Amino acid sequence: VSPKTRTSNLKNGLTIASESNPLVQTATVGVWIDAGSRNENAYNNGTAHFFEHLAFKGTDKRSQHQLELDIENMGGHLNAYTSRESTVYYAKSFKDDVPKSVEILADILQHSKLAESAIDREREVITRELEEVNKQYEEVVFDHLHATAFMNQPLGRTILGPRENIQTITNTELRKFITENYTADRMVLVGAGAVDHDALVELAEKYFSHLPSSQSPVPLGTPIPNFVGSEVRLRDDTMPVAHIAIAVEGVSWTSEDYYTALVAQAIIGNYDRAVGTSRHQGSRLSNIVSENNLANSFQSFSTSYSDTGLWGIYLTSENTTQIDDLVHFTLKEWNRLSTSVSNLQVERAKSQLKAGLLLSLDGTTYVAEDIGRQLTTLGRRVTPAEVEAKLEAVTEHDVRAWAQKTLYDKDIALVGLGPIEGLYDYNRIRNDMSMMRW
Amino acid sequence: ASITSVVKTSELILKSPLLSKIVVPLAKTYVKFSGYRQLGFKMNDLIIEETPNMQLALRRLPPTESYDRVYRLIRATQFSLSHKLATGNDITKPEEDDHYLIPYILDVEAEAFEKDALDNLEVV
Amino acid sequence: ASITSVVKTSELILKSPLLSKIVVPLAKTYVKFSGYRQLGFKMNDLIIEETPNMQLALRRLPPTESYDRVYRLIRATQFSLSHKLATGNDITKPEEDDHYLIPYILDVEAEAFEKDALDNLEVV
Amino acid sequence: FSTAEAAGVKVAAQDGQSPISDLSVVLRGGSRYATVPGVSHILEKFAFQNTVPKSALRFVRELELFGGKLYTHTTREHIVLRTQFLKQDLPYFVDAFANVLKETKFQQFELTERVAPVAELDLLKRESDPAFTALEAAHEVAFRTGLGNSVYAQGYSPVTLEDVKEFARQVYAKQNVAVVGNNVVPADLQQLVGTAFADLQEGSKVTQAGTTTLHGGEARVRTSTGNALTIALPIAEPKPVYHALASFLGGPASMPWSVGASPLAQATVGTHTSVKATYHNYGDAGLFAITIKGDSPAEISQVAHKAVQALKDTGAEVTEEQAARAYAKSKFAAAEAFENPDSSASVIGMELLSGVSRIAPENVQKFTPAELSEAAAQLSASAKPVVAAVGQVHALPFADEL
Amino acid sequence: FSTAEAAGVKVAAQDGQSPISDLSVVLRGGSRYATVPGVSHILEKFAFQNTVPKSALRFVRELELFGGKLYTHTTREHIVLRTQFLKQDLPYFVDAFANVLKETKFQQFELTERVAPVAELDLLKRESDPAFTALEAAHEVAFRTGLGNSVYAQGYSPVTLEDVKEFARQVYAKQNVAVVGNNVVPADLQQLVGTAFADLQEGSKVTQAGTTTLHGGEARVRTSTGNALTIALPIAEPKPVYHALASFLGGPASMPWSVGASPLAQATVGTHTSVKATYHNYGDAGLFAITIKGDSPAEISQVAHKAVQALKDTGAEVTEEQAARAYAKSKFAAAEAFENPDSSASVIGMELLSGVSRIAPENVQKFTPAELSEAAAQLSASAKPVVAAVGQVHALPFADEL
């Protein structure tokens, strides 16, 4: 039994959430924000990402050099990431270097200089990154997957944004974005590791008290996405490995089918030829794939957002003449989630998840990420007991019912990249989403 | 029938004193009248090999055993097409009729059968 | 007919003032009514490719020319199946209709024809 | 971590307040002790193959029912086999480790079909990073044998089943085995290890064939997969001041989209390269290395010259600020090393097997500017500098240029 | 060989009494002058490809009608293109060389389909011998660039059509071209070369980018083609005494099924290894090399230690008999080199292109025992010993050990 997550509020509406650990000597403190690239329009797309760059480019007081020195003097590191619906700015430091790291964060968030010269310097950096994301094949595949699944919708936009916007983002647009979105009722100050909650709340009162509140404070994790069955093919015969993702519309964080979708995802599971144990996994798809050498890897996913999600699989394969077999057998395993799954598969997957959901929370950063994610998406840290109960309530009937409404005979979003000549047209892939024998 | 089945049933018989006393002499005469040794075969050379399990066990043979098996098959094929029997050193002596393949196929089948059982496990 | 034949005969015509004066306008009208440019093709995209000589010339294309040819074939195939014509930038302009392939195939054929001649040489 | 002894096996455990336990077996069987090149990597990959009581297949299927995970790695000093599971499943995991150490059937087909292919993919994935290659080549030049043996199996030196069986006969023995339990009740572990590992051979301490000898030289590795350069300095007397020196010199950034205030980080300015100062304490010997990776070999050449200059500049004199930074960053490094289970296991493993009492992050020494500058001065004036170039080696610097 | 000049081209010919003539074009275009690695090898392989007057195909078909043959090779100093034919067919061969030098169409498809594949098979065949590899690696360590450039094209560094076209623009020019005719009437050659090579550009002398530098070190090449080791000693002052030294030291047997009386040959006794002392005069620098190839790395290690000892023993004392034997072996070596058409062409080529007058075999200097001892002592006291292990490099000696 892990220690209780303590939670307090300030007057402005800033949540402070902490989970202490006496064994560690190092503590992760950071700010989880319920805002991301989804909050941009098509004219400022890429602003959130641009700000992340400029947050570490100098503040009202300290310059970029001074900022660097200050963090180095603490001894720890600062890190940040922007997603579609969440922005995070954390600081891993020593036990005694927690107050100073908290001070640095409040400064970069509330009073960043955003100098015009610094903007111009970052423009080139971001422009370079736009023509360097190509290398990260998995990211390319998933960015195209969102773009096609949520065609012409805010969830379908890239985080980096288009080249055109990058050349036109001004300090005004930047300031407007962070003034509208980085409000106290949308922010959670999170501490994990060697933190005292009462100390953290005092530091929040000292640094984050003059944060604006939004005009209409909705609860944390408050959102209509209309999924498009569709495909993107990025054929490249010079690549040796094909990368293919297939997804259907999945479930949001607060769906009643949230855990049922995770159990279904665990029945298919992951596979990697480089891991020694993978040839012995219980998953039917894993056995088919390893015995026939159909793939280098596959990873099932169930990605959630506030009002939608994507559930599917990501495959990598060098077997270019049997891509058809790989996809065929994958979708036939999905069909079995609706037609054949019994207590056997379900209980096995639940057993695996019961551990996996706790196992994920390794170090202080992992714990802080969990607290922050849960606070910004659900509005609360769900206790392991509640999670164990929600998983226990998933039955074989629930999985079959969920699959029959979500997978069976449904439109898919499909992205292929690389030597995908062997990937059949949309109809033949989508026809595998049902079985004529059933 | 699986090699596993054959080996286990044979072991049940060899355990029983009565059974072994009556079965072992019959099995030895059977093998003499079978006459595979007169084509220079070992018993295991006759086992059906066109299954996934057997192809796996044959790939696991040590290279020397594998090369010698190839030669015995080619030599028996040449006796068969000529309508001749082995003579002299080509005849398999009872002491040379070793079960070189049985251990490999028993391991292949042990895994295959465990996989089938474990595919049907029920969390209690 | 060989590309060589076509190119040489055309060169005979272009030399003769009279002939060129009468043939070049007809050839230009022919090309306009042919209408391959309205599917975004270049003339050389239409040449029959299922020959050893042509497969060799296509392998010798610079990678850029080769990738662009692939795109123009796929794009024309999509116009054909949709019963649409190219519009705007997809239409091949006369200045874009370059003979990117002719030099490669003329070199392939020059070698092929020399080989045939030399296979029939007689020492004098 | 309460150190004890259970049936002749050293057991260290630290109870916690979490649902997840980590149990690690640390073996004195890393590559410095290897008998044949690559055998310690192959032995690591042979863990949790078929044992007499439990097949590899059955183990994996049962591990999935507990939702446990398995992690293994090889260093120059240890093989580490770690399992992560829910607290209550402890007896199963202790028994599984016992089966591996006492009853592994080392079958030829497992070596050919399972173990060696996985070892080969492991190495190819690591080598995708040219910095990994450069730092491995630097150890090979600097120490030749022992610490200079390759950590990983390579194709050019084939490990046989007899090699792995012999090495396992030495390594899988009470004298070479330490058990480390994170978030495990110490009294419960001692009782279980005491019953499970009672019939393990005693064996003898595996020793390094030959004394550690220090050499200098160059290693040019032509790859077509990116460029790196290590400037390593073998140390005969490994001092803890080199830890502070590495942390000071630095190389990486401590914030996103930044270079960093560290000397080596300020040597990459204007290029697309990355530097990393790394000290490797190895008991009898040590290695201080400055690894510079990048795309352009010319860019690497530039940074390499600035890197050597930075070390000389440090040797001249460092300020009180710089000294305080070194200590702060070194204490943080120690803290996170003792936190991460991968490295935690090996730290206590070294205390249990070897005898080197762990240095708590709170007991990391503060070095004065004098002591830091003296340490850097001792490195700039080394008689045996090692340079390992990887990639376009014709365009990368040589030792005599640096 | 009567040296003359015909239309700005240096022409050397020697008439004979045989039906067979050899005509060689020697080009100052060997690897020490190579703009990019491998370009001189690729240029050599591009000779007799398609020219504007005559396709590669037509040339080969006509060469067969004359029964002529074509030989080409690349050294560190030259590209040599040689043809062998009947005396009377001289004008055809002169014209074919002119077409190659003036009118080669350097087409991309020839590079991809014809030239580079042939260059790659050429190298793989040479590397089948690990002694070739060891001696190549030793030049690379000793000189780095220039003389340290690879002679042959390698896969890791691709030569482009633009590289080869640029280099040919420099090399195929009157200033870099020498014509050598064996069994060719000298007056007839001068008249033909004078008409055929009149319109060749004048160009300028190709030079080595940078001054030749001498270095020491190690080169461990892990192969499985066999095992070899070169003990190279770079010479800053090229002297003819090292020719007699190499001959004296020896290594190969003088008779079938023997070992040989030579010091190095008497270091292989008991083993199945083979040694060879070789001196490489390069005008501005030199390289003394002792290459030991064999099956067993342990055997090689033994011979390698005896090899360095033999050199030290020579430095101590050579007998008068040994000095006379060195003179005899060295005179014979000179004679056969001037006979072999490949080496003959390059010897006169050096005289014509540089100005280094050839040393006739009858004018080979006799070095006193004192002179030979001096030479070997200088090599034993070289401050830059180069070692190049090939094969199981872990089991082969290091520079420090020798």
Swiss-Prot record, chains B, C:
Q: Which SUPFAM superfamilies match?
A: 14 kDa protein of cytochrome bc1 complex (Ubiquinol-cytochrome c reductase) (SSF81524)
User: What taxonomic classification does the UniProt entry list for its organism?
Assistant: Eukaryota, Fungi, Dikarya, Ascomycota, Saccharomycotina
- Name of the protein described by the UniProt record: Cytochrome b-c1 complex subunit 7
Q: How does it assemble?
A: Component of the ubiquinol-cytochrome c oxidoreductase (cytochrome b-c1 complex, complex III, CIII), a multisubunit enzyme composed of 3 respiratory subunits cytochrome b, cytochrome c1 and Rieske protein, 2 core protein subunits, and additional low-molecular weight protein subunits. The complex exists as an obligatory dimer and forms supercomplexes (SCs) in the inner mitochondrial membrane with cytochrome c oxidase (complex IV, CIV).
Q: Which GO terms describe its cellular component?
A: matrix side of mitochondrial inner membrane; respiratory chain complex III
Q: Which domain of life is it from?
A: Eukaryota
Q: Which InterPro entries match?
A: QCR7 (IPR003197), QCR7_sf (IPR036544)
What molecular functions are annotated in GO for this chain?
ubiquinol-cytochrome-c reductase activity
PANTHER family, per this entry? CYTOCHROME B-C1 COMPLEX SUBUNIT 7, UBIQUINOL-CYTOCHROME C REDUCTASE COMPLEX 14 KD PROTEIN
Record-stated family: Belongs to the UQCRB/QCR7 family.
What keywords tag this UniProt record? Answer: Electron transport, Membrane, Mitochondrion, Mitochondrion inner membrane, Respiratory chain, Transport
Q: Name one GO biological process term.
A: mitochondrial electron transport, ubiquinol to cytochrome c
Question: How does the entry describe its membrane topology?
Answer: Peripheral membrane protein
Swiss-Prot record, chains D, E:
Q: How does it sit in the membrane?
A: Peripheral membrane protein
**Membrane-crossing residue ranges in chain numbering:** none
Record's family?
Answer: Belongs to the peptidase M16 family. UQCRC2/QCR2 subfamily.
Q: Which organism is it from?
A: Yarrowia lipolytica (strain CLIB 122 / E 150) (Yeast)
Descriptive protein name: Cytochrome b-c1 complex subunit 2, mitochondrial
Instruction: Tell me where in or outside the cell this protein is found.
Output: Mitochondrion inner membrane
Oligomer status and interactors: Component of the ubiquinol-cytochrome c oxidoreductase (cytochrome b-c1 complex, complex III, CIII), a multisubunit enzyme composed of 3 respiratory subunits cytochrome b, cytochrome c1 and Rieske protein, 2 core protein subunits, and additional low-molecular weight protein subunits. The complex exists as an obligatory dimer and forms supercomplexes (SCs) in the inner mitochondrial membrane with cytochrome c oxidase (complex IV, CIV).
**GO terms for biological process?**
mitochondrial electron transport, ubiquinol to cytochrome c; proteolysis
UniProt key word Transport: yes
Specify the taxonomic lineage: Eukaryota, Fungi, Dikarya, Ascomycota, Saccharomycotina
Cross-referenced InterPro entries: Metalloenz_LuxS/M16, MPP/UQCRC_Complex, Pept_M16_N, Pept_M16_Zn_BS, Peptidase_M16_C
